[PDB]
Design a protein around this ligand. Sequence first.
Ligand SMILES: [Lu+3]
Ligand SMILES: [Lu+3]
Lengths: 662, 663
Amino acid sequence: PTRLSLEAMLAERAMVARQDLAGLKRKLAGADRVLAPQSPEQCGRESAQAQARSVTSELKSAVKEAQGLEHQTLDFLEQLGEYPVCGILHGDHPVHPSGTHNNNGKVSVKRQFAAGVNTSDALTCAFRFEDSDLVRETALKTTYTDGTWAGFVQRLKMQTTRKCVQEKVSRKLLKQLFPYDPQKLVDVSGELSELVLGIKTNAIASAGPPYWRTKRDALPDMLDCVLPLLYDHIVRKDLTTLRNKHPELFLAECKNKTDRYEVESLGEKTRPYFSHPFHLSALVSVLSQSFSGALKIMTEDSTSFNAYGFSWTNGGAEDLAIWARQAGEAGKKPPRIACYGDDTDIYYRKDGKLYRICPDFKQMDGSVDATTIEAVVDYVVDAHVKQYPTARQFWEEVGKLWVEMATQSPFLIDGTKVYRKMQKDGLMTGVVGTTLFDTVKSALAYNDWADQLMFGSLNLLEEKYAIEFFKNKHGLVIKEGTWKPALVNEDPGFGELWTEQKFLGLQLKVVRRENEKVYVPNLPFEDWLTMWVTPRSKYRSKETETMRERTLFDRARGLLVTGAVFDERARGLMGAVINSTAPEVVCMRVQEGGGRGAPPAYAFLTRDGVFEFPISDGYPSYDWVVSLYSRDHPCDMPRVFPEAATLIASYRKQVMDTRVVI
Amino acid sequence: PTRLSLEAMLAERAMVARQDLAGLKRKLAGADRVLAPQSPEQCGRESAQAQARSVTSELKSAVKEAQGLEHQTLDFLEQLGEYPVCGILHGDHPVHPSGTHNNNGKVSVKRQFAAGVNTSDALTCAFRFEDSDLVRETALKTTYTDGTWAGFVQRLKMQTTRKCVQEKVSRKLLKQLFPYDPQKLVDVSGELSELVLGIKTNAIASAGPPYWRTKRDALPDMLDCVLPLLYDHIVRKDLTTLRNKHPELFLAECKNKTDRYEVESLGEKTRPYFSHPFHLSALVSVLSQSFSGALKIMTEDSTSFNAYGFSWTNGGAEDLAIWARQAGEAGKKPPRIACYGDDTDIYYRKDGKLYRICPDFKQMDGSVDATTIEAVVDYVVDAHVKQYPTARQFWEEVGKLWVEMATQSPFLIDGTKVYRKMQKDGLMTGVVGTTLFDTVKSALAYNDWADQLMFGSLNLLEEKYAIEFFKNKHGLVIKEGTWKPALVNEDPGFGELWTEQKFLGLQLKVVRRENEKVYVPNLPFEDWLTMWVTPRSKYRSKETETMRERTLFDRARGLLVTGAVFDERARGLMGAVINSTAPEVVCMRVQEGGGRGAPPAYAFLTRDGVFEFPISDGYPSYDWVVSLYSRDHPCDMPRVFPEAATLIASYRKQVMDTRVVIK
Ligand SMILES: [Lu+3]
Ligand SMILES: [Lu+3]
């Protein structure tokens, strides 16, 4: 009687079983568990939480004080009038949801500066498996918060009133610094709906005005209502009429970015970003995302300054080293320069010796000139149009909107007053293409820096003159103390570092796989600990104690994969967290990661950004994590409970050989 | 940002949308619907419902009375004692559940003859769109019931006490009549757990004793405890010890089969079958299923008598015709004989003209001799051992268990008394390989029938001498009136039939597609109508009104695919049901068919029985069904609501050309 195989029955049985924790607990009672390397227990649960709770209160006290500070006035921004709420309807309901973002018919919004900080669950784990003096110091240094009004306004002022230097950039120069594969460019000559449906974005992210919902809840309304309307006005050159009738259709929202902030500067620093209308962002994302997918990176073309698209896993970390060594003698041969937004990696040789530099830009978004922004939008639009000339007219018009969004969009801050930057200079952070805009601006400066080296200006290898140079000739602010070129260990031994410097937030280290060197990311334990005790997520009301224990497990796997596994103390910490996780929590059915578990928070592991754990009940072992960064990857992810898929099915392994003699 | 494409978001949005009937009805309020050809409404909703209940009540009354009849005694079966309940444990529970099949320590089981019949749902639809006199007359003829104590004991006695004729069969003849492909044989040389986990079965089916639960709920106990225990006593040749300590591990249960039955013969016909212990049936299923997966069929090898594995779709119906035409002159050239269980199709030529014969056996299981059973088991075991000799002894030991289960396997009927068939002859229906055993028995007989035609015995073409032949030489009972050779239409025109005869329960018919001929299955409206108004499912109170209405939709698609679409009246009745189905029910999310919808009941559409609909919200059109039975590229299944996927996600696509000139 055929229907469903026995193996399928067991599988179907297990899937049902791991949805019942209480039952899952009994099924894994005496199950052979594989413990991961962990740190020894330092104190009990009670003390660990009490100490962790004490730190959190002291952090809220600091945040509370800073948030009480008076903030500067917004008289540095052009003040437009008040915008009326969009009366557009999508059949039965209005595109602008009634009862939200409305003040007597005028569009409104309210900035959120909460006192709440973190969950402190991860902090309890730290106090439990590490020295307290070290844990408390690290925890009190940084915190996850909404920031402060004072820091928000001050930071907004800085990136909207800075004197910029217009760049001398041409298509010839951009084709040289940022080469791409025309064949990888998306066919923009196709129908618009298909193109837009192809762009990727965060479903939870705000749709901006006039939707005031998630991009998921507002997707339909913008797709067969707002988009069509926008399109018809674009082709008829009648954008101005649509702007006057529905001002909110082009309104942006200036927001304070909740993030990890230094506690001793919460009152003078809170990064602002701009959230544009879904239909505008999604439309340009057709070009922006198309172009990034065609862009060659530093390790694919040694003439390219582009690091935007670089990833560590799959030999990627080794690629950096192999490419970095191509650096020539300062003054005689060209250096190696990789640009990834505000982040940059510089290599040069002095007397044959390889040196590395990892400078920081002090809020370079306020240094991005309109000439560079507009020259990039042209480079992108011209690239597509040069490939599919049948649609030149339309996308050139889109480039105009793209430039407006990046520099001169009207936005709300707090309340009902609408604002706008006095000057076109300065990049409005958050706009589609922010990473590219920063990269090109950064690359053009360093490309100039390289040219000066050839004249023999080897004094530009020094912080003093470097800082002076980037400020006068490019208007970029190199943070003092970040220009410290270090001698590079070109052939690291087992366990040795490339340099103690960072790129994309990580160090380059060499480890032993099996008689072979593997290049992998690494960080000091203090840095791993800082990220751990400072999860980017505030206390949610309905997050049960179970889903909370699972978050520790998933965050622990993530950090290990990012490189925490290559540090002793950090490895042990995540190891202690994983081993202290209940069996039913390790083998439960999770939703994140397509059921395979939430992926690492780090965004530069794979170029497509998509990292997926093999199984949800597996722990990151040293041999498995190394295989992610090696060019081979001949390794499966080990299970915390070997022989668990059977136990969940209420049966156990048993070999019954049919070859036996009777 | 970048988490997932917008196209993906609409997909997720569409997924949750098809899980809310209220919202789903709302979105599909004024959507465009492609209506299937239907019969006009014959009478109102209340009137159709009134006539339906009245009929089902008659059928209940008929079944209730038939169940009150007295049945014969079980004196014809060997009288064994009582078996003790198996007190084997798994950890937190015993293999034999507490307070279930137990009577003061002794194994027990009660036979179920309830007076529940049908549901009246499909029948109400029939009265609504069809002739009252026809629907009434058709529905009153048969019902889906448990049967009766009388017909159950009668049919059991007949198949357990018939005088059989031992077949002269050898491995040589079996290779000649049943050729297979050694490469397609499962490597039973490596491990048992992996092999046993390879066999497929019904999860809702009883695991038998001592589990007394569904195979799904007893699987863990069977695999992790009982099976390993059985293995040890097999390798040590100590099965006689395990029998005398845990008799229930070898005990079977004789059950009455709930099914469609003729009402006027409820007291005479209720087919019995045997359900062996899970660990046994699964163990032998390894060899059985492996062999049928490697078996050649008539249309793949002319010398083969095998029809076990034949399917209709994908040119199957035309394959049968192309194979049948090869039949030679009776006496001179060999005929064309295909055997599938007790069902058999025969073709021969008399003065050039082709004739077809579709005879019926009377409970063939009672006629299956023990020698044929042994010969078949040895044939299957030898085939696997010839391929993988490194495990010969083990599976040969299994062949011993296989033969036992098919003949001398002890069993319970009702109460607590253990019975057994006194003779090794007669096949215990239900045993793994029942289809194969019947097929081989039928082939050995017809193969001999074929040889007699060569000896000049052309009188065996006549029913009078055919019946006498199968009886005297093979103990096979040909049901009188079923041996009636019909002149075959070798090249049927558009809309014409192969013959009015049935094979595998369907007729062979030729239909038109543009200009080419297509061979497809077919039945009279009366036969489609009988299957429709007689669903093989009893009334279940824990089944909502939405579930019932969805089932009408599914069964309507299933019959159309099976061939109801090629009958004008049947096509119209099924179309009426589909069109009368609520949009929220059509585009609803279903669980059956892996989310694609419940597959057709007919299990001879494809070789592996699995027919999967492309979509759950589509309807079987004439064009789509025909492409299923043809050999080339089945068309896309037409959606009931062509604008469905869009309207669900609250989306309406609008062409925006990027290649447009700007003002
Ligand atoms: Lu200390
Ligand atoms: Lu009439």
